[PDB]
Amino acid sequence: DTIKWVTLKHNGVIFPPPYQPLPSHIKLYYDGKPVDLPPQAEEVAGFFAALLESDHAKNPVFQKNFFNDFLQVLKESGGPLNGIEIKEFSRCDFTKMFDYFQLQKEQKKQLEKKQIRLEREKFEEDYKFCELDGRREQVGNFKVEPPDLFRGRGAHPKTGKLKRRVNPEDIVLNLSKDAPVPPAPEGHKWGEIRHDNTVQWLAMWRENIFNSFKYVRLAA
């Protein structure tokens, strides 16, 4: 196949921050009672609550898909902590979560901005460029998209389904054999460290909605 590179050195991808649980006074309510949710379930419920006043929030297909995925994450996480048992979408009340998110948004309007802009781009400096064939090359797509609910257009049957968080374990890094491997985060390991010179991608993984590939590729 056409050899795309002789040598390729890179620092991988930037993972979105880990989820931060909501403050104790912000909960999903089920039949009017506050539900103590494990963080993974809470995160997923929060995706719907943030979208509470959007068109998507009233689309029954969106509600169905979100709810089935929410119940699935709930099960994986061991269920609610205060024994409530969530069985029906209609008994769920996301209002306080929604109002809190709106409050969060509003508070941010008071930001500092450019400084953050600087501390970020300085950090991203290491991922925005790679060294290919000994030359500094630019990389587009060094950030993995954060989890959220898939918003499909029209009568998309999968609208409302959860796009899961992509972990290091799902990713394949492609680089020169001798090239130093960028440490995966915290206590994770990479899904694979490949050394294929016939492809120009730097990292690759699959997204869960359509089973298609995502890639970290070089700028045009």
Side-chain angles (χ1 to χ4, degrees), residues 87-214:
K87 295 174 168 103
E88 302 173 348
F89 173 82
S90 302
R91 293 181 182 282
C92 288
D93 170 14
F94 302 95
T95 312
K96 187 114 51 144
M97 275 179 160
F98 172 70
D99 282 347
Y100 176 78
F101 290 133
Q102 299 289 267
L103 147 156
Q104 281 202 314
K105 270 84 175 179
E106 182 178 276
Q107 289 173 344
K108 288 156 202 175
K109 306 227 168 307
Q110 278 178 61
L111 279 175
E112 301 190 327
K113 288 178 168 65
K114 288 59 193 181
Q115 191 213 49
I116 291 183
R117 190 178 184 236
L118 299 184
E119 301 193 60
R120 182 192 54 87
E121 303 169 325
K122 201 141 299 151
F123 167 75
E124 302 185 345
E125 177 76 347
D126 317 33
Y127 307 84
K128 188 186 180 193
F129 301 107
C130 70
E131 182 149 82
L132 180 67
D133 294 341
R135 267 210 149 210
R136 187 48 40 178
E137 301 287 4
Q138 196 164 323
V139 167
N141 270 185
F142 49 98
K143 291 194 272 183
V144 6
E145 292 152 37
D148 205 334
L149 302 186
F150 168 62
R151 287 151 48 250
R153 76 209 69 205
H156 200 119
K158 297 186 177 68
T159 199
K161 279 193 139 293
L162 169 74
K163 290 181 289 173
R164 309 185 79 115
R165 184 179 288 273
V166 173
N167 286 301
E169 289 81 13
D170 302 308
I171 296 155
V172 182
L173 300 186
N174 191 42
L175 29 37
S176 276
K177 293 164 184 288
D178 288 326
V181 177
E186 304 184 76
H188 293 265
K189 59 107 199 313
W190 290 105
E192 189 197 338
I193 296 296
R194 196 171 295 177
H195 301 114
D196 177 32
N197 73 325
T198 51
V199 287
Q200 250 179 295
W201 50 262
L202 276 57
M204 168 211 253
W205 62 91
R206 279 210 175 196
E207 48 82 28
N208 73 287
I209 307 298
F210 307 100
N211 258 110
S212 67
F213 291 96
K214 306 298 271 233

